[PDB]
Coordinates of C-alpha atoms and ligand atoms in Angstrom, one line a residue:
Chain T
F10 CA 19.1 -24.2 -0.9
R11 CA 19.3 -27.7 -3.2
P12 CA 17.9 -27.5 -6.9
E13 CA 16.6 -30.9 -6.6
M14 CA 14.1 -29.0 -4.5
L15 CA 12.7 -27.7 -7.7
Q16 CA 13.2 -31.5 -9.7
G17 CA 9.4 -32.4 -10.0
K18 CA 8.0 -28.8 -9.3
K19 CA 4.7 -27.2 -10.7
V20 CA 5.4 -23.4 -10.7
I21 CA 3.3 -20.6 -12.4
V22 CA 5.3 -17.3 -13.2
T23 CA 3.5 -14.4 -14.5
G24 CA 5.1 -11.1 -16.0
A25 CA 6.9 -14.0 -17.8
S26 CA 7.9 -12.8 -21.3
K27 CA 10.4 -10.5 -20.6
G28 CA 13.0 -9.2 -17.7
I29 CA 13.2 -10.7 -14.2
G30 CA 10.3 -12.9 -14.8
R31 CA 11.7 -14.7 -17.9
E32 CA 14.6 -15.7 -16.2
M33 CA 13.0 -17.4 -13.3
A34 CA 11.1 -19.2 -15.9
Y35 CA 14.5 -20.2 -17.7
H36 CA 16.0 -21.3 -14.1
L37 CA 13.0 -23.0 -13.4
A38 CA 13.1 -24.7 -16.5
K39 CA 17.0 -25.9 -16.0
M40 CA 16.2 -27.1 -12.9
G41 CA 13.7 -29.1 -14.5
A42 CA 10.6 -27.7 -13.0
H43 CA 7.2 -27.8 -14.7
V44 CA 6.5 -24.3 -15.7
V45 CA 3.2 -22.3 -17.1
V46 CA 4.2 -18.6 -17.9
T47 CA 1.9 -15.7 -18.5
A48 CA 1.7 -12.4 -19.8
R49 CA -0.4 -10.1 -22.3
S50 CA 2.2 -11.0 -25.3
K51 CA 1.3 -14.0 -26.8
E52 CA 3.9 -14.2 -29.5
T53 CA 6.7 -13.6 -26.9
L54 CA 5.6 -16.4 -24.6
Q55 CA 5.7 -18.8 -27.8
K56 CA 9.4 -18.1 -27.6
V57 CA 10.1 -18.3 -23.7
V58 CA 7.9 -21.7 -23.7
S59 CA 9.9 -23.4 -26.4
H60 CA 13.1 -22.0 -24.9
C61 CA 11.9 -23.7 -21.5
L62 CA 11.2 -26.8 -23.2
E63 CA 15.1 -26.7 -24.7
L64 CA 16.5 -25.9 -21.2
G65 CA 15.2 -29.0 -19.7
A66 CA 11.7 -28.0 -18.4
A67 CA 9.7 -31.1 -17.0
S68 CA 7.1 -29.3 -19.1
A69 CA 6.1 -25.9 -20.3
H70 CA 3.1 -23.9 -21.3
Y71 CA 1.9 -20.4 -21.9
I72 CA -1.7 -18.9 -21.1
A73 CA -1.5 -15.1 -22.5
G74 CA -4.0 -12.3 -21.1
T75 CA -4.1 -9.2 -18.9
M76 CA -4.1 -9.1 -15.5
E77 CA -6.3 -6.1 -15.4
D78 CA -9.1 -8.6 -15.9
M79 CA -10.0 -10.3 -12.7
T80 CA -11.8 -13.2 -14.2
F81 CA -8.8 -13.9 -16.9
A82 CA -6.6 -13.9 -13.8
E83 CA -8.9 -16.1 -11.6
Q84 CA -9.2 -18.4 -15.0
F85 CA -5.4 -18.5 -15.3
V86 CA -4.8 -20.4 -12.1
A87 CA -7.3 -23.0 -12.8
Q88 CA -6.0 -24.0 -16.3
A89 CA -2.2 -23.5 -14.9
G90 CA -3.4 -26.0 -12.3
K91 CA -4.7 -28.4 -14.9
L92 CA -1.9 -28.3 -17.4
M93 CA 0.7 -29.1 -15.0
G94 CA -0.6 -31.4 -12.2
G95 CA -1.5 -29.2 -9.6
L96 CA 0.7 -26.2 -8.1
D97 CA 3.7 -26.0 -5.9
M98 CA 4.5 -22.5 -6.1
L99 CA 2.9 -19.4 -7.6
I100 CA 5.5 -16.2 -8.6
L101 CA 3.5 -13.1 -9.1
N102 CA 5.8 -10.9 -10.5
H103 CA 4.0 -9.1 -13.3
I104 CA 3.2 -5.1 -13.1
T105 CA 1.4 -2.8 -15.2
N106 CA 3.9 -0.7 -17.5
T107 CA 5.2 2.3 -15.7
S108 CA 7.9 4.7 -16.1
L109 CA 9.3 7.8 -14.1
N110 CA 7.6 10.9 -14.0
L111 CA 6.1 13.3 -11.3
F112 CA 2.6 12.5 -10.5
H113 CA 0.1 15.3 -11.6
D114 CA -3.4 14.1 -11.7
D115 CA -3.1 10.7 -13.6
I116 CA -5.6 9.0 -11.5
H117 CA -6.1 6.2 -14.1
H118 CA -2.4 5.3 -13.7
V119 CA -2.8 5.0 -9.8
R120 CA -6.1 3.3 -10.3
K121 CA -4.2 0.8 -12.9
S122 CA -1.1 0.2 -10.8
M123 CA -3.4 -0.7 -7.9
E124 CA -5.4 -3.3 -10.2
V125 CA -2.7 -5.0 -11.8
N126 CA 0.4 -4.9 -9.3
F127 CA -1.8 -5.4 -6.2
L128 CA -5.1 -6.7 -6.7
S129 CA -4.5 -9.2 -9.3
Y130 CA -1.7 -10.5 -7.0
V131 CA -4.6 -11.0 -4.3
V132 CA -7.1 -12.7 -7.1
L133 CA -4.3 -15.1 -8.2
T134 CA -3.4 -15.9 -4.6
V135 CA -7.2 -16.6 -3.6
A136 CA -7.5 -19.0 -6.6
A137 CA -4.3 -20.6 -6.2
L138 CA -4.8 -21.5 -2.6
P139 CA -6.4 -24.7 -2.5
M140 CA -3.5 -26.4 -4.6
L141 CA -0.8 -24.6 -2.8
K142 CA -2.4 -26.0 0.7
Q143 CA -2.0 -29.6 -0.9
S144 CA 1.7 -29.2 -1.3
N145 CA 2.5 -26.9 1.5
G146 CA 3.7 -24.7 -1.2
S147 CA 4.7 -21.1 -1.6
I148 CA 3.8 -17.5 -2.8
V149 CA 6.3 -15.5 -4.1
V150 CA 5.7 -11.9 -4.3
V151 CA 8.1 -9.7 -6.2
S152 CA 8.4 -6.3 -5.0
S153 CA 10.9 -3.5 -4.4
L154 CA 13.0 -0.9 -2.7
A155 CA 10.2 1.7 -3.6
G156 CA 8.0 -0.9 -1.8
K157 CA 9.8 -0.3 1.7
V158 CA 11.3 3.4 1.2
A159 CA 9.5 6.3 -0.6
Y160 CA 11.0 7.6 -3.9
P161 CA 9.9 10.0 -6.0
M162 CA 8.6 9.6 -9.5
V163 CA 7.0 6.3 -8.7
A164 CA 4.4 7.4 -6.4
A165 CA 1.6 4.8 -7.8
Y166 CA 3.8 2.0 -8.4
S167 CA 5.2 2.5 -4.7
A168 CA 1.6 2.8 -3.4
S169 CA 0.8 -0.5 -5.1
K170 CA 4.1 -2.3 -3.7
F171 CA 3.5 -0.9 -0.3
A172 CA 0.0 -2.5 -0.4
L173 CA 1.5 -5.7 -1.5
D174 CA 3.6 -5.9 1.8
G175 CA 1.0 -4.7 4.1
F176 CA -1.9 -7.2 2.8
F177 CA 0.9 -10.4 2.3
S178 CA 2.5 -9.7 5.6
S179 CA -0.8 -10.0 7.1
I180 CA -2.1 -12.9 5.5
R181 CA 1.3 -14.5 6.3
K182 CA 0.8 -13.9 10.4
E183 CA -3.0 -15.4 9.7
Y184 CA -1.6 -18.3 8.0
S185 CA 0.7 -19.3 10.7
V186 CA -1.8 -19.6 13.4
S187 CA -4.4 -21.0 11.0
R188 CA -2.2 -24.4 10.5
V189 CA -2.2 -23.0 7.3
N190 CA 1.2 -24.6 5.6
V191 CA 1.7 -22.2 2.8
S192 CA 5.0 -20.1 2.8
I193 CA 4.9 -16.2 1.6
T194 CA 8.1 -14.6 0.6
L195 CA 8.4 -10.8 -0.1
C196 CA 11.6 -10.0 -2.7
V197 CA 12.8 -6.5 -2.4
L198 CA 14.8 -5.6 -5.2
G199 CA 16.8 -2.7 -6.3
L200 CA 17.6 -1.7 -9.9
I201 CA 18.1 -4.7 -11.9
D202 CA 19.5 -5.3 -15.6
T203 CA 16.3 -5.4 -17.4
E204 CA 15.6 -3.6 -20.7
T205 CA 12.5 -1.6 -19.2
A206 CA 14.4 -0.5 -16.2
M207 CA 17.4 0.5 -18.1
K208 CA 15.5 2.4 -20.4
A209 CA 13.1 4.2 -17.6
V210 CA 16.1 5.2 -15.8
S211 CA 17.7 6.7 -19.0
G212 CA 20.3 9.1 -17.0
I213 CA 17.6 9.9 -14.2
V214 CA 19.2 7.4 -11.8
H215 CA 22.9 7.1 -11.0
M216 CA 22.6 3.4 -9.2
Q217 CA 24.6 0.4 -10.2
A218 CA 22.2 -2.1 -12.0
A219 CA 22.2 -5.7 -10.7
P220 CA 22.4 -8.6 -13.2
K221 CA 19.0 -10.1 -14.0
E222 CA 19.8 -13.5 -14.2
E223 CA 21.2 -13.4 -10.7
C224 CA 18.4 -11.9 -9.1
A225 CA 15.9 -14.2 -11.0
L226 CA 17.8 -16.9 -9.0
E227 CA 17.9 -15.3 -5.9
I228 CA 14.0 -14.9 -5.9
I229 CA 13.5 -18.8 -6.6
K230 CA 16.0 -19.9 -3.9
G231 CA 14.3 -17.6 -1.2
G232 CA 10.8 -18.9 -2.1
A233 CA 11.9 -22.4 -2.1
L234 CA 13.6 -22.2 1.6
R235 CA 10.3 -20.5 2.6
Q236 CA 12.0 -17.5 3.6
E237 CA 9.9 -14.5 4.7
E238 CA 11.8 -12.0 2.8
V239 CA 14.5 -11.7 -0.2
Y240 CA 16.6 -8.6 -0.2
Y241 CA 18.5 -8.2 -3.7
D242 CA 20.4 -4.8 -4.7
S243 CA 24.0 -4.2 -5.7
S244 CA 24.9 -1.6 -3.2
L245 CA 26.0 -2.5 0.1
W246 CA 24.9 0.2 1.9
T247 CA 21.2 -0.6 0.9
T248 CA 21.2 -4.1 1.7
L249 CA 22.0 -3.1 5.3
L250 CA 19.9 -0.2 5.6
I251 CA 16.8 -1.5 4.0
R252 CA 16.2 -3.9 6.8
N253 CA 13.6 -2.8 9.5
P254 CA 14.4 -4.7 12.8
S255 CA 11.8 -2.7 15.0
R256 CA 9.3 -3.6 12.5
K257 CA 10.3 -7.3 13.7
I258 CA 10.2 -6.6 17.6
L259 CA 7.2 -4.3 17.3
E260 CA 5.2 -7.1 15.7
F261 CA 6.3 -9.6 18.6
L262 CA 5.1 -7.2 21.3
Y263 CA 1.7 -6.4 19.7
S264 CA 1.6 -10.2 19.0
Chain W
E8 CA 7.6 27.5 16.6
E9 CA 5.1 26.1 19.0
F10 CA 1.5 25.2 18.4
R11 CA -1.3 28.0 18.9
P12 CA -5.1 27.3 18.4
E13 CA -4.7 30.6 16.9
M14 CA -2.8 29.0 13.9
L15 CA -6.4 27.6 12.4
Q16 CA -8.9 30.5 12.1
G17 CA -8.8 31.8 8.9
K18 CA -8.6 28.3 7.5
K19 CA -10.9 26.5 5.3
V20 CA -10.9 23.0 6.5
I21 CA -12.1 20.0 4.8
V22 CA -12.8 17.0 6.9
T23 CA -14.1 13.6 5.7
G24 CA -15.7 11.0 7.4
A25 CA -16.6 13.4 10.1
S26 CA -20.1 12.0 10.9
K27 CA -18.5 10.0 13.8
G28 CA -15.2 8.7 15.8
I29 CA -11.9 10.8 15.3
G30 CA -13.4 12.7 12.5
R31 CA -16.3 14.2 14.3
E32 CA -13.9 15.3 16.9
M33 CA -11.5 16.9 14.6
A34 CA -14.3 19.1 13.4
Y35 CA -15.3 19.8 17.2
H36 CA -11.6 20.9 17.8
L37 CA -11.5 23.1 14.4
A38 CA -14.8 24.7 15.0
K39 CA -13.8 25.6 18.5
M40 CA -10.7 27.5 16.8
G41 CA -13.0 29.5 14.7
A42 CA -12.4 28.0 11.2
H43 CA -14.7 27.4 8.2
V44 CA -15.2 23.6 8.1
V45 CA -16.9 21.5 5.3
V46 CA -17.5 17.9 6.5
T47 CA -18.5 15.0 4.6
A48 CA -19.7 11.3 5.3
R49 CA -22.2 8.9 3.6
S50 CA -25.2 9.3 6.2
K51 CA -27.0 12.7 6.2
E52 CA -28.7 13.7 9.6
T53 CA -25.7 12.6 11.7
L54 CA -23.7 15.1 9.6
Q55 CA -26.7 17.6 10.1
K56 CA -26.3 16.8 13.9
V57 CA -22.5 17.9 13.5
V58 CA -22.6 20.9 11.2
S59 CA -25.0 22.2 13.9
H60 CA -23.0 21.2 17.0
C61 CA -20.2 23.1 15.0
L62 CA -21.5 26.4 15.8
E63 CA -22.5 26.0 19.2
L64 CA -18.5 25.9 19.7
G65 CA -17.8 28.8 17.5
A66 CA -17.0 28.0 13.9
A67 CA -16.8 30.7 10.9
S68 CA -18.7 28.4 8.5
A69 CA -20.1 25.2 8.8
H70 CA -21.5 22.9 6.0
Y71 CA -21.7 19.4 5.1
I72 CA -21.9 17.0 1.7
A73 CA -23.2 13.5 2.0
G74 CA -22.1 10.9 -0.6
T75 CA -20.1 7.7 -0.2
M76 CA -16.4 8.0 -1.4
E77 CA -16.9 4.8 -2.9
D78 CA -17.8 7.1 -5.9
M79 CA -14.8 8.6 -7.4
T80 CA -17.4 11.4 -9.1
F81 CA -18.6 12.4 -5.7
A82 CA -15.0 12.7 -4.4
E83 CA -13.9 14.7 -7.5
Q84 CA -17.0 16.9 -7.0
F85 CA -17.1 17.4 -3.2
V86 CA -14.2 18.7 -3.2
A87 CA -15.1 21.2 -6.0
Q88 CA -18.4 21.9 -4.4
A89 CA -17.1 22.6 -1.0
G90 CA -13.9 25.2 -2.0
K91 CA -16.9 26.9 -3.9
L92 CA -18.5 27.0 -0.3
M93 CA -15.6 28.7 1.5
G94 CA -13.8 30.5 -1.3
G95 CA -10.8 28.2 -1.2
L96 CA -9.4 25.2 0.5
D97 CA -6.6 25.4 2.9
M98 CA -6.6 22.3 4.6
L99 CA -7.3 18.8 3.5
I100 CA -8.0 16.1 6.1
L101 CA -8.4 12.7 4.8
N102 CA -9.7 9.9 7.3
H103 CA -12.9 8.3 6.2
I104 CA -12.4 4.4 6.0
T105 CA -15.2 1.7 4.7
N106 CA -16.5 -0.4 7.5
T107 CA -14.0 -3.1 8.1
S108 CA -14.6 -5.7 10.8
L109 CA -11.7 -8.1 11.9
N110 CA -11.7 -11.4 10.4
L111 CA -9.2 -13.8 8.8
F112 CA -9.0 -13.2 5.3
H113 CA -10.5 -16.1 3.0
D114 CA -11.9 -15.2 -0.5
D115 CA -13.2 -11.5 0.3
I116 CA -11.5 -9.7 -2.8
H117 CA -15.0 -7.7 -2.8
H118 CA -13.7 -6.4 0.7
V119 CA -10.1 -6.0 -0.5
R120 CA -11.1 -3.8 -3.5
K121 CA -13.4 -1.8 -1.6
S122 CA -10.6 -1.2 1.0
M123 CA -8.5 0.2 -1.5
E124 CA -10.9 2.1 -3.4
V125 CA -12.5 3.8 -0.3
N126 CA -9.6 3.7 2.1
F127 CA -7.0 4.8 -0.6
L128 CA -8.1 5.6 -4.1
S129 CA -10.6 8.2 -2.7
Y130 CA -7.8 10.1 -1.0
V131 CA -5.7 10.1 -4.1
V132 CA -8.9 11.5 -5.9
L133 CA -9.4 14.0 -3.4
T134 CA -6.1 15.1 -3.1
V135 CA -6.1 15.5 -7.1
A136 CA -9.3 17.5 -7.0
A137 CA -7.9 19.6 -4.1
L138 CA -4.6 20.4 -5.3
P139 CA -5.2 23.8 -7.4
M140 CA -6.7 25.3 -4.3
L141 CA -4.0 24.0 -2.1
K142 CA -1.3 24.7 -4.1
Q143 CA -2.5 28.3 -3.9
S144 CA -3.4 28.3 0.0
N145 CA 0.0 26.6 0.6
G146 CA -2.1 24.0 2.3
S147 CA -1.7 20.9 4.5
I148 CA -2.9 17.5 3.4
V149 CA -3.3 15.2 6.7
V150 CA -3.7 11.5 5.8
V151 CA -4.9 9.5 9.0
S152 CA -3.4 6.1 9.1
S153 CA -2.3 3.3 11.6
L154 CA 0.1 1.0 13.4
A155 CA -1.4 -1.5 11.1
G156 CA 0.0 0.8 8.4
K157 CA 3.6 0.7 9.4
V158 CA 3.6 -2.7 10.7
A159 CA 2.1 -6.2 10.2
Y160 CA -1.4 -7.3 11.9
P161 CA -3.2 -10.3 11.3
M162 CA -7.4 -9.7 11.1
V163 CA -6.6 -6.3 8.9
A164 CA -5.0 -7.7 5.9
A165 CA -7.2 -5.8 3.5
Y166 CA -7.2 -2.6 5.9
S167 CA -3.5 -2.9 6.4
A168 CA -2.9 -3.0 2.6
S169 CA -5.0 0.4 2.1
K170 CA -2.8 2.0 5.0
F171 CA 0.5 0.6 3.7
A172 CA -0.5 2.1 0.3
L173 CA -1.2 5.6 1.6
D174 CA 2.2 5.5 3.1
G175 CA 3.8 4.5 -0.1
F176 CA 2.2 7.0 -2.3
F177 CA 2.1 10.0 0.1
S178 CA 5.7 9.6 0.9
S179 CA 6.6 9.6 -2.8
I180 CA 4.6 12.7 -3.4
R181 CA 6.1 14.5 -0.6
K182 CA 9.5 13.8 -2.2
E183 CA 8.2 15.1 -5.6
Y184 CA 6.6 18.2 -4.0
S185 CA 9.7 19.0 -2.1
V186 CA 11.8 18.9 -5.5
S187 CA 9.0 21.0 -7.7
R188 CA 9.0 23.6 -4.8
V189 CA 5.4 22.7 -4.5
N190 CA 4.7 24.3 -1.1
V191 CA 2.0 22.0 0.2
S192 CA 2.4 20.0 3.5
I193 CA 1.8 16.2 3.7
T194 CA 1.1 14.7 7.3
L195 CA 1.1 11.1 7.8
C196 CA -0.5 10.1 11.1
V197 CA 0.1 6.8 12.7
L198 CA -2.6 5.7 15.3
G199 CA -2.8 3.5 17.8
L200 CA -6.0 1.9 19.3
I201 CA -8.2 4.7 19.8
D202 CA -11.5 4.4 22.0
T203 CA -14.0 5.3 19.1
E204 CA -17.2 3.1 19.0
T205 CA -16.3 1.5 15.8
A206 CA -12.9 0.4 17.3
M207 CA -14.2 -0.4 20.6
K208 CA -16.8 -2.9 19.4
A209 CA -14.9 -3.9 16.2
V210 CA -11.8 -5.0 18.6
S211 CA -14.0 -6.2 21.7
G212 CA -12.7 -9.4 22.8
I213 CA -9.7 -9.5 20.7
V214 CA -7.2 -6.6 20.7
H215 CA -6.3 -6.5 24.1
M216 CA -4.5 -2.8 24.5
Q217 CA -5.2 0.4 26.0
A218 CA -7.4 2.7 24.1
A219 CA -6.4 6.2 23.7
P220 CA -8.9 8.8 24.4
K221 CA -10.6 10.1 21.0
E222 CA -11.1 13.4 21.6
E223 CA -7.4 13.9 22.7
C224 CA -6.0 11.8 19.7
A225 CA -7.9 14.6 17.0
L226 CA -6.2 17.3 18.4
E227 CA -2.9 15.7 18.3
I228 CA -3.8 15.0 14.6
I229 CA -4.4 18.8 13.7
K230 CA -1.8 20.5 15.7
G231 CA 0.2 18.2 13.5
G232 CA -1.2 19.2 9.9
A233 CA -1.0 22.9 11.6
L234 CA 2.7 22.2 12.1
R235 CA 3.4 20.8 8.7
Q236 CA 5.2 18.0 10.3
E237 CA 5.9 15.0 8.0
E238 CA 4.1 12.4 10.6
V239 CA 2.5 12.4 13.8
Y240 CA 2.4 9.2 16.4
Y241 CA -0.4 9.2 18.6
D242 CA -0.4 5.7 20.6
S243 CA -0.6 5.0 24.3
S244 CA 2.2 2.8 24.5
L245 CA 5.6 3.8 25.5
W246 CA 7.3 0.8 23.5
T247 CA 5.2 1.9 20.3
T248 CA 6.1 5.5 20.1
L249 CA 10.1 4.6 20.8
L250 CA 9.8 1.8 18.2
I251 CA 7.9 2.5 15.6
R252 CA 10.0 5.3 14.1
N253 CA 12.4 4.3 11.2
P254 CA 15.7 5.7 10.9
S255 CA 17.3 3.6 8.3
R256 CA 14.2 4.5 6.1
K257 CA 15.3 8.0 6.4
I258 CA 18.6 7.7 5.9
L259 CA 18.0 5.3 3.0
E260 CA 15.7 8.2 1.5
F261 CA 18.5 10.9 2.3
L262 CA 21.6 9.0 0.6
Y263 CA 19.2 8.4 -2.6
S264 CA 18.0 11.8 -2.6
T265 CA 21.5 12.8 -4.4
Ligands
LIG1 N1 14.1 -4.3 -13.0 C1 13.9 -3.6 -11.7 O1 14.7 -3.0 -11.9 C2 13.1 -3.9 -10.8 C3 11.8 -4.9 -10.9 N2 11.4 -5.0 -9.8 C4 10.0 -5.9 -10.0 O2 10.3 -6.9 -10.9 C5 9.2 -7.5 -11.4 C6 9.7 -7.8 -12.8 O3 10.1 -5.9 -13.2 P1 10.9 -6.3 -14.7 O4 11.2 -7.8 -15.2 O5 12.0 -5.2 -14.7 O6 9.7 -5.9 -15.6 P2 9.8 -5.9 -17.3 O7 8.7 -4.8 -17.6 O8 10.9 -6.4 -17.9 O9 8.8 -7.2 -17.0 C7 7.1 -6.9 -17.2 C8 6.5 -8.3 -17.4 O10 4.9 -8.1 -16.8 C9 4.2 -8.2 -18.0 N3 3.1 -7.2 -18.1 C10 2.7 -6.0 -18.1 N4 1.7 -5.6 -18.1 C11 1.1 -6.7 -17.8 C12 -0.4 -7.1 -17.9 N5 -1.4 -6.2 -17.7 N6 -0.6 -8.4 -17.3 C13 0.0 -9.3 -17.5 N7 1.5 -8.8 -17.8 C14 2.0 -7.6 -18.0 C15 5.1 -8.1 -19.2 O11 4.6 -8.9 -20.2 P3 3.5 -8.0 -21.3 O12 4.0 -6.7 -21.7 O13 3.8 -9.1 -22.8 O14 2.2 -8.4 -20.8 C16 6.2 -8.7 -18.8 O15 6.2 -9.9 -18.9 C17 8.0 -6.5 -11.2 O16 7.2 -6.9 -10.1 C18 8.8 -5.4 -10.6 O17 8.0 -4.4 -9.7 C19 11.5 -4.4 -8.6 C20 12.4 -3.4 -8.4 C21 13.2 -3.2 -9.5
LIG2 N1 -10.1 4.0 16.1 C1 -8.9 3.5 15.9 O1 -8.7 3.0 17.0 C2 -8.2 3.7 14.8 C3 -8.5 4.5 14.1 N2 -7.6 4.9 12.8 C4 -7.8 5.6 11.5 O2 -8.9 6.7 12.1 C5 -9.6 7.2 10.9 C6 -11.0 7.2 11.7 O3 -11.6 6.2 12.6 P1 -12.3 5.8 13.5 O4 -13.2 7.7 13.5 O5 -12.2 4.9 14.8 O6 -13.9 5.1 12.5 P2 -15.5 5.4 12.6 O7 -16.2 4.1 12.1 O8 -16.0 6.1 13.6 O9 -15.2 6.6 11.4 C7 -16.0 6.1 10.3 C8 -16.2 7.5 9.2 O10 -16.1 7.2 8.2 C9 -17.5 7.7 7.4 N3 -17.6 6.7 6.2 C10 -18.0 5.5 6.3 N4 -17.8 4.8 5.2 C11 -17.8 5.6 4.3 C12 -18.0 5.9 3.0 N5 -18.1 4.7 2.0 N6 -17.8 7.1 2.4 C13 -17.6 8.1 2.9 N7 -17.8 8.3 4.4 C14 -17.5 7.0 4.8 C15 -18.4 7.2 8.6 O11 -19.9 8.2 8.3 P3 -20.8 7.0 7.5 O12 -20.5 5.8 8.0 O13 -22.2 7.9 8.1 O14 -20.7 7.0 5.8 C16 -17.7 8.0 9.7 O15 -18.0 9.4 9.7 C17 -9.6 6.0 10.0 O16 -8.8 6.3 9.0 C18 -9.1 4.9 10.5 O17 -8.2 4.1 9.5 C19 -6.5 3.9 12.7 C20 -5.8 3.3 13.9 C21 -7.0 3.1 15.1
LIG3 C1 12.7 4.9 -8.6 C2 12.7 3.6 -8.0 C3 14.1 2.8 -7.9 C4 13.8 1.3 -8.3 C5 15.3 0.9 -7.9 S1 13.3 1.0 -9.6 C6 11.9 0.2 -9.1 N1 11.0 -0.5 -9.8 C7 11.0 -0.4 -11.2 C8 9.9 0.6 -11.4 C9 10.2 1.6 -12.6 C10 9.5 1.4 -13.7 C11 10.2 0.6 -14.6 C12 10.5 -0.9 -14.5 C13 9.8 -1.3 -13.0 C14 10.6 -1.5 -11.9 N2 12.0 -0.2 -7.8 C15 12.8 0.5 -7.2 O1 13.0 0.7 -6.0
LIG4 C1 -5.8 -5.1 14.6 C2 -5.8 -3.6 14.5 C3 -4.9 -2.7 15.5 C4 -4.9 -1.2 15.1 C5 -4.8 -0.7 16.5 S1 -6.8 -0.9 14.9 C6 -6.5 0.0 13.4 N1 -7.3 0.5 12.8 C7 -8.7 0.6 12.9 C8 -8.9 -1.0 12.4 C9 -10.1 -1.7 13.0 C10 -11.4 -1.9 12.3 C11 -12.4 -0.8 12.9 C12 -11.9 0.6 13.5 C13 -11.0 1.2 12.3 C14 -9.5 1.7 12.6 N2 -5.2 -0.2 13.1 C15 -4.3 -0.7 14.2 O1 -3.1 -0.5 14.1

């Protein structure tokens, strides 16, 4: 990895107002990328754009809205496009707000989780592809342990996250033979410093929490190296245990 | 602790997507074991032709309810107006899927959405709808999935996302139910290539593997939900069974189980 890599670079970061998303903003701004950030929360985004500008961003812009809204999602990429001079890398990071609870019958939240953490990711990917094909760019899709392994209390979430792996890991095999030179990186994250995670695991989880500023960069690094996947967790056993190598082989044979 | 056709006799079993392929056979076997059976699917007389064949084999009770699992309400209600037909629900077999051909993904969000709605959401909806009854029956949910549901495949991106989703949701729920001492089993079935008409033709001149027999497949699925297993693996390759099990996942789930 060379940060010279992101020198003149055009990067969208969704879910960019707080947490791991913001920090990418800032890393991307330090590396003097161009950045367009998004979330629902307008007044927060003003604050990160201007922080990005301070930090050395080649340029920085926000566009606020909600990714339950597919036409906003599709419209978001075209404008993001036009603000910078095209697009080099698209980092899908946002998620519908969630917390730990047993699942009872909340079917609105299963649906919302599916639409916002999954479907919006497809809608943004479809819209963003022309520009990415022109730069041989990159999709970075942020997932989690619970999108690789099953965990109780995060059923909906987990379902949207498995979906992310399924859909994109499949798109990527398609791209490969389609001479579609857009890379696709799946980030698998354990617990991270962020305010909203720390508050959500409120004594429910006794798992060491990883620095958010560092995870942020790991995500960029990975996507910039066109890596199929990024694992990022504090525990040692997890990083070892989380990899599925028989998936890799099994895929070759079936290939 | 062996499998006995005897096991499924009192049992009120819903089968979905039963008007053809695996689903049909599943309802044949069930009836041969003398269970009450309700089946759904969109198309109506194909279902009549199944309810009817289902007595010739020796059910206990056979009905059907036509509707598209595209509509959450139908799903809510179908279950309701079906436990009402059998007295309770004892087993829920979920296996309907929205027609998917096999093409590279371009811009068909429509197909993606329909795929999530029909292939995943409806199963959740029906689970919710079926639960009061199952919690009581000590029932057995059984979700039919696929290799594409555990492993990546080109051509089936939207389909794959919906199968991968069934695993991440139903495995969590399994975990919650386990801690809630909710005594409902959840069986995830990973199926390889099966010689259904849909598959046969969907995959003609493209996926070059053996085609596990449909009628054998469906029994394996039942034996599975019958025995309260966490998963069943039915494919026609030795490689497959041998590689597809993921012991790291089970350990990772253990470690974290504390
Ligand atoms: N933190 C952790 O421990 C882990 C995080 N991850 C992944 O990290 C990514 C970021 O997580 P984290 O930073 O902790 O989460 P945060 O809750 O801190 O960040 C959430 C971001 O997404 C935004 N958001 C929420 N709803 C919507 C919406 N409907 N439309 C658009 N934006 C929305 C929020 O902005 P706003 O409210 O203003 O709209 C905010 O910018 C997620 O994909 C998560 O799945 C994975 C594993 C662990
Ligand atoms: N066949 C194979 O090789 C494999 C099968 N599987 C899984 O096996 C299960 C059954 O597959 P298979 O039997 O081959 O496929 P079929 O096409 O034979 O089965 C489709 C069933 O779904 C019903 N259906 C279709 N659309 C809807 C709808 N919108 N609402 C309600 N019902 C609908 C159909 O009835 P109608 O169209 O009349 O509505 C039919 O009874 C699926 O879950 C599939 O994922 C997994 C891997 C491989
Ligand atoms: C039990 C989940 C364990 C955990 C380390 S936490 C996670 N994602 C979080 C979901 C919880 C909602 C609060 C913020 C969202 C990010 N993924 C994981 O694998
Ligand atoms: C490339 C698909 C490899 C295959 C064995 S076939 C599959 N599911 C089928 C999807 C095909 C659409 C029509 C029939 C429905 C069921 N799952 C797999 O793993």
